[PDB]
Design a protein around this ligand. Structure first.
Ligand SMILES: N[C@@H](CCC(=O)N[C@@H](CSO)C(=O)NCC(=O)O)C(=O)O
Ligand SMILES: N[C@@H](CCC(=O)N[C@@H](CSO)C(=O)NCC(=O)O)C(=O)O
Ligand code: NA
Ligand code: NA
Ligand code: NA
Ligand code: NA
Ligand code: NA
Ligand code: NA
Lengths: 217, 217
């Protein structure tokens, strides 16, 4: 049988980006673990998939992909329907706003939020490494300034790209989910339109399914 | 058909990403400078274009965009022809490789190459800031490992996504051009297929036109 394969730990943020997209479009898939403890990500077998030796990678027949956003867009295109059109590529202005807010995640929001996840969650929980409180403080101040902008945006529309959910919103889910596992989760409550947006995403069945994979089973 | 407008200094890397895409598709445009000396990027007029107060921004009628890659994709879609189709969105596997290598620029290549540009070129030439040789050395070692991967890829095809030029290749132009103005330019000679690809991009008429805009006096 023909499920597509995602390679990497299911709970890894960038894997969860891809599995969320797969769930949203109703595609059949399997997640194949990659064991970092044996350097499997640097094995020749995995380097054939991603020559830079990272996860996720992805296989659909003879096509091997890497870079979570590239994988995700392939999925969103391949399995597109009229009812689940998360890129909006037939409407140039809508597609442009999807792209803008996807880029805002990559270049503005995630660089502010991710260090807090690293320092407050990944460091202590993965290998028991310390937290750098200077990094956390600096990042929180940058994140507050980002959230001020998101608060204004999400007072004008229910989602980032307009009055429709899109890949832009989905891209914010994996790292933000882990931010909600840190002691700084309540920050979002100070930006009520951002909180309402987050709650809307968390209510989505595909998001619930992937959130359940981002915990300890 | 009034020309579309690109806002920012013409020689800025992320402005040049956009103007290269505009030249490749033969679109009429104007570059409108944004004066950082008077904080014009933080003025209400510019914040209406990019609420994060960065350049580039872009206007087409009533549409305002920011984030250079989002602007660029809007351009490549709007002005697409069968002859100049730089995203390949009608072919899932080709679009996927364009997307992979666009992501590799953003998340792998540019993070290794751009600090060398900053330390060796932008620091001394813009404000007269010092150079951090530790940053340069660490970045060079990362870049060498990246270039090994590019060398293998560019032995299989003349361009990153396949046997056709695409947005993936164009994304590498602006920072790489400035890297070639640093004392480390010769690094590429150690990767003959990467150097041959670079020379092919530099031979393109659109690339020549934008390279001429990328000067200080
Ligand atoms: N931009 C890429 C990031 C992948 C990545 O960082 N993967 C990490 C796991 S998370 O810190 C990884 O595989 N690292 C191993 C390494 O670099 O050796 C994407 O979105 O796919
Ligand atoms: N990912 C974005 C980066 C734009 C940017 O950094 N712009 C800088 C100029 S270059 O260092 C900028 O406008 N900075 C002003 C500021 O952040 O205050 C893009 O691709 O458009
Ligand atoms: Na849930
Ligand atoms: Na549930
Ligand atoms: Na929860
Ligand atoms: Na001007
Ligand atoms: Na595209
Ligand atoms: Na290859």
């Amino acid at each position: 049988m023909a499920p597509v394969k995602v390679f990497g730990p299911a709970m890894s943020t960038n894997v969860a980006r891809v599995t969320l997209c797969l769930e949203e479009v109703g595609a059949e898939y399997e997640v194949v673990n990659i064991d970092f403890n044996t350097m499997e990500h640097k094995s020749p077998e995995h380097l054939a998939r991603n020559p830079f030796g990272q996860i996720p990678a992805f296989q659909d027949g003879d096509l091997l992909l890497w870079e979570s956003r590239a994988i995700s867009k392939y999925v969103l295109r391949k399995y597109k329907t009229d009812e689940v059109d998360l890129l909006r590529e037939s409407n140039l202005e809508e597609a442009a706003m999807v792209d803008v807010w996807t880029e805002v995640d990559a270049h503005t929001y995630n660089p502010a939020l991710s260090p807090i996840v690293y320092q407050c969650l990944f460091n202590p929980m993965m290998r028991g490494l310390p937290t750098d409180e200077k990094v956390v403080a600096e990042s929180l101040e940058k994140l507050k300034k980002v959230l001020e902008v998101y608060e204004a945006r999400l007072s004008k529309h229910s989602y980032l790209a307009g009055d429709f959910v899109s890949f832009a919103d989905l891209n914010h889910f994996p790292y933000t989910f882990y931010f909600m596992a840190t002691p700084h989760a309540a920050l979002f409550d100070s930006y009520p339109h951002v909180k309402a947006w987050w709650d809307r995403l968390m209510a989505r069945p595909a998001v619930k399914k992937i959130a359940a994979t981002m915990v300890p089973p």
